[PDB]
Copies of this chain bind each other. A is one copy, B any other.
Amino acid sequence: RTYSDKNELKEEVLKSYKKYIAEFNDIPEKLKDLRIDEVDRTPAENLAYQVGWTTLILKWESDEQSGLEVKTPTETFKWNQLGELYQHFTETYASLTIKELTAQLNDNVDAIGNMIDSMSDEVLFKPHMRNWADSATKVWEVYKFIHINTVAPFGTFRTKIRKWKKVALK
């Protein structure tokens, strides 16, 4: 286990989200669709990606609550249709303002906060407790493994060591 309890997970979600969404404060609406060569996504596409995926994970849990046997990311799109799914995210939130996208993403992140609260320690942290989690596990590229063993723990274990320093180095 890498998060110790649901409180720690919730705090990391909240704090990473705040750092992320704060960056869009200074972006003019007229530039929401501005694409540069150095970065693949526009500000609008950047936010739309988060709105799309956070909507889906909430849907999975909802559908599973209903007894639905959920193996697909969505209505329509395969686990091999992700490039097309991201495309779908972009048009669904196309011509939405940064302000509007931010409002919706805020709502989703809170819903996720509530989902964590409403989940016992067990269904959050033990295997085979949601069939959508099992199913979604059913192909990973090299770059995902690199991220999962560098960027991801370098973030979460940095939070851990800072908490250790708070208590130990006083």
**A residues apposed to B, CB below 8 Å:** 1, 3-4, 6, 8-9, 12-13, 16-17, 19-20, 23-24, 26-27, 31, 34, 36, 38-43, 46, 49-50, 53-54, 56-57, 109, 112, 115-116, 119, 123-130, 133-134, 136-137, 139-147, 149-158, 160-165, 167-169
| With known contacts A23-B158, A50-B154, A109-B150, A119–B142 Cβ distance under 8 A | yes
Copies in the complex: 2
User: Per a CB cutoff under 8 Å, which of B13, B41, B147 touches A160?
Assistant: B41
What chain B residues lie within 8 Å of A123 (beta carbons)? Answer: 142
Interface residues of A, dominant DSSP:
helix
A115, chain B: closest CB distance, angstroms: 8
